[PDB]
Amino acid sequence: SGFRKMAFPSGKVEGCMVQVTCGTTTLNGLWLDDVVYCPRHVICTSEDMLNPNYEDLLIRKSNHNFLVQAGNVQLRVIGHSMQNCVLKLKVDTANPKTPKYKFVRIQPGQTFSVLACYNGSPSGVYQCAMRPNFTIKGSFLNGSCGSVGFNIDYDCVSFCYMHHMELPTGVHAGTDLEGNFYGPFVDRQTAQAAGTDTTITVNVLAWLYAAVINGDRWFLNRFTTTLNDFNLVAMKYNYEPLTQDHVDILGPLSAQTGIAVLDMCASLKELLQNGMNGRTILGSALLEDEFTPFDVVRQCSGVTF
Amino acid sequence: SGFRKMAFPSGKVEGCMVQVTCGTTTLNGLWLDDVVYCPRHVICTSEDMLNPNYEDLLIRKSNHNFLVQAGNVQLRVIGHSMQNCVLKLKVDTANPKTPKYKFVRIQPGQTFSVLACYNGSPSGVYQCAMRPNFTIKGSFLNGSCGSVGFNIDYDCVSFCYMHHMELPTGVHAGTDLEGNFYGPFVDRQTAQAAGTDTTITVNVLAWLYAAVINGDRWFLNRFTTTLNDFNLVAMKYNYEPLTQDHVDILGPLSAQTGIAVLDMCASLKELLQNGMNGRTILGSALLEDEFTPFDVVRQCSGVTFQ
Ligand SMILES: Cc1cncc(CC(=O)N2CCC[C@H]2c2cccc(Cl)c2)c1
Ligand SMILES: Cc1cncc(CC(=O)N2CCC[C@H]2c2cccc(Cl)c2)c1
Ligand SMILES: [Br-]
Ligand SMILES: [Br-]
Ligand SMILES: [Cl-]
Ligand SMILES: [Cl-]
Ligand SMILES: [Cl-]
Ligand code: NA
Numbered sequence: 370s371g372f373r374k375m376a377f378p379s380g381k382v383e384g385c386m387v388q389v390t391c392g393t394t395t396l397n398g399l400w401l402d403d404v405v406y407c408p409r410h411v412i413c414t415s416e417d418m419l420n421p422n423y424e425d426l427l428i429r430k431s432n433h434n435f436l437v438q439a440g441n442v443q444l445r446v447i448g449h450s451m452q453n454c455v456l457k458l459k460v461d462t463a464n465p466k467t468p469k470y471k472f473v474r475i476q477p478g479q480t481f482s483v484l485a486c487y488n489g490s491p492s493g494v495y496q497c498a499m500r501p502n503f504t505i506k507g508s509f510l511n512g513s514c515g516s517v518g519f520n521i522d523y524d525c526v527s528f529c530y531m532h533h534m535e536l537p538t539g540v541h542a543g544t545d546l547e548g549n550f551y552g553p554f555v556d557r558q559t560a561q562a563a564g565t566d567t568t569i570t571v572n573v574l575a576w577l578y579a580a581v582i583n584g585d586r587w588f589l590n591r592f593t594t595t596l597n598d599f600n601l602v603a604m605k606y607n608y609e610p611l612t613q614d615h616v617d618i619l620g621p622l623s624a625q626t627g628i629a630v631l632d633m634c635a636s637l638k639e640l641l642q643n644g645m646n647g648r649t650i651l652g653s654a655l656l657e658d659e660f661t662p663f664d665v666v667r668q669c670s671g672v673t674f
Numbered sequence: 675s676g677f678r679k680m681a682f683p684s685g686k687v688e689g690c691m692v693q694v695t696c697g698t699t700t701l702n703g704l705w706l707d708d709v710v711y712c713p714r715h716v717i718c719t720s721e722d723m724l725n726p727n728y729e730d731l732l733i734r735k736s737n738h739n740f741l742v743q744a745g746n747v748q749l750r751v752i753g754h755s756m757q758n759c760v761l762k763l764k765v766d767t768a769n770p771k772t773p774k775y776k777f778v779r780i781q782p783g784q785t786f787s788v789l790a791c792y793n794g795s796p797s798g799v800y801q802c803a804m805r806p807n808f809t810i811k812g813s814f815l816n817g818s819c820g821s822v823g824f825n826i827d828y829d830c831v832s833f834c835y836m837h838h839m840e841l842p843t844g845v846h847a848g849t850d851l852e853g854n855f856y857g858p859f860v861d862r863q864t865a866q867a868a869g870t871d872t873t874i875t876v877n878v879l880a881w882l883y884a885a886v887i888n889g890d891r892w893f894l895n896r897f898t899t900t901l902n903d904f905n906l907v908a909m910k911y912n913y914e915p916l917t918q919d920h921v922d923i924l925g926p927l928s929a930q931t932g933i934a935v936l937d938m939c940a941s942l943k944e945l946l947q948n949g950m951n952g953r954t955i956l957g958s959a960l961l962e963d964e965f966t967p968f969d970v971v972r973q974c975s976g977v978t979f980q
Contacts (some may be wrong), residue, residue, distance in 0.1 A: 370813075370814075371811060371813075371845075373800040373811075374679060374800065375813060376681060376799050378688050378797075379683045379684050379799070380685025380688040383683050384685070428825055491683040493680035493973070494680065494682070494683055494684065495680045506676060508675075508676035508680060508973060509676060510975055539675030539889075541676070577691065582726060583844070623686075625843060625955065649960075652811075653960070654959035654960050655954075655959045668813060671790075671792045671797055671815045671817065672797060673791065673792050673793065673797045674795065
């Protein structure tokens with residue numbers, strides 16, 4: 370029993386973290402086989418960040434301008450190029466600890482684990498969700514750029530996020546490992562802001578199923594609703610629309626508990642309209658939206674890697 | 675910016691997890707050097723759990739009654755002994771991935787990372803606090819016994835917890851790595867239950883300091899308190915007494931924010947009286963007590979957002 374915000378074990382990713390320094394900037398890189406991936410803004414000074422021409426800034430750098438350190442060992446850079454907002458440094462040594470991996474781009478609402486890193490050394494691991502506004506509510510300080518997000522499936526690490534920046538509200542933005550930004554953000558020092566966010570409805574429903582699996586059932590009721598009626602309430606409360614694909618993805622949790630998704634939607638509609646009346650769900654006074662349906666099944670069934 | 679329940683990177687502990695089977699029971703063990711540590715109840719059947727005599731159950735076992743598997747490799751058991759509630763299986767091969775480590779028995783209020791495992795394989799990692807009633811609020815299913823808790827401050831793994839059981843309220847109990855239970859619990863199926871729990875006051879104050887470092891002061895007020903008056907109030911809300919040792923450990927956070935510890939105590943007394951009035955603190959609508967002062971310093975900026 371119990372239900373915690375659980376991260377994936379991070380060992381396979383720890384063995385990939387290195388430090389990358391270019392000029393006065395030091396950040397983290399991901400070393401897979403003979404390539405080190407990191408944010409391309411490592412090549413910029415503060416003045417360059419105001420209006421960077423990355424192609425011209427990179428033409429001016431040589432391989433020797435990048436110092437890459439894996440623990441106490443210097444890896445020699447033998448080539449460099451950019452793929453979108455990611456710099457790729459070819460090194461003379463392949464990482465002997467490279468796991469089986471893929472680069473995957475995720476959608477808003479999906480969760481992943483972050484291995485927060487400073488100076489190429491892993492510091493901590495936590496789980497989070499990609500918000501509907503494409504930001505992440507991470508925990509990052511200066512020097513954390515290049516820290517990555519991932520999921521595991523069996524023995525394969527799926528890397529999905531590389532950290533690039535903090536926005537004025539203290540939330541974070543970054544790219545996939547092919548260097549494509551999540552959200553309408555750029556790697557330039559200009560006015561940028563997180564857009565208005567919404568709550569991930571399918572995830573709140575998944576977490577209400579986790580609460581029923583754990584014995585918290587006070588919010589269940591005799592009513593059902595329709596997908597149309599529920600979506601009119603979701604829009605009013607700044608919740609994402611629930612689609613038939615979301616109803617299908619909640620299928621396994623609905624089958625395990627015996628509670629139809631539209632029956633659980635009637636519970637959520639009443640919680641949105643009335644509040645919790647001084648009660649909690651799984652120890653929380655807020656409706657939690659950073660567990661996907663698969664996260665609940667994994668945790669409640671003890672899936673291992 | 676941001677503030678999350680942050681666990682230590684688990685790799686150094688993942689390389690120590692193994693599966694131990696005795697009879698029909700399979701659970702996890704921790705392989706360090708040439709010893710595998712696991713809960714001694716691996717030798718019990720369900721009926722043995724009502725009134726087990728562990729000395730009598732163990733004398734009937736040979737080394738070859740223990741099967742230990744590290745990934746796809748079987749490790750040969752060459753000796754066994756019991757230390758309190760932990761079985762120590764000597765194996766013929768030392769773990770080549772043994773990290774620098776120590777064993778530490780912690781106090782209530784201290785936090786640690788848990789690597790929850792099944793069949794010797796990791797499922798996930800999360801942070802826990804040792805509650806004042808000597809339980810932990812984990813996430814563990816049958817088969818998770820032998821999963822461990824640890825901290826990794828300064829590249830050395832300090833193992834502080836080994837999981838043994840779930841109590842009737844769904845909370846968890848276990849031992850240190852010398853096999854002594856935290857709390858009054860026993861590895862026997864008795865009517866034992868978690869005592870009434872209390873809130874870890876020093877941790878709530880540390881987390882209010884984290885909120886100020888991260889830029890929020892709305893909950894402060896113009897008052898101060900004596901330590902005794904604060905404790906008389908706090909105990910009425912089932913908060914643990916705050917000691918002078920707790921006030922000392924909050925010193926660095928007080929220095930960084932310019933808020934005297936007894937002035938943050940006056941803020942907490944007012945938050946217990948008023949609630950948050952629709953606001954949140956670090957994303958929470960409830961007062962959080964599973965971050966220690968050391969955990970706040972570990973995670974937060976050393977520069978306050980004034
Ligand atoms: C506190 C913190 C936490 N996470 C990351 C950072 C890094 C950050 O925001 N940087 C670094 C260069 C200047 C700035 C930036 C500005 C604009 C676009 C980008 Cl990609 C980057 C800081
Ligand atoms: C769901 C779950 C989560 N965590 C661990 C367990 C294991 C558990 O509670 N066991 C196993 C043997 C019988 C029982 C027990 C009973 C009494 C004392 C001890 Cl040490 C152990 C179960
Ligand atoms: Br301690
Ligand atoms: Br909450
Ligand atoms: Cl940086
Ligand atoms: Cl009703
Ligand atoms: Cl078990
Ligand atoms: Na209903």
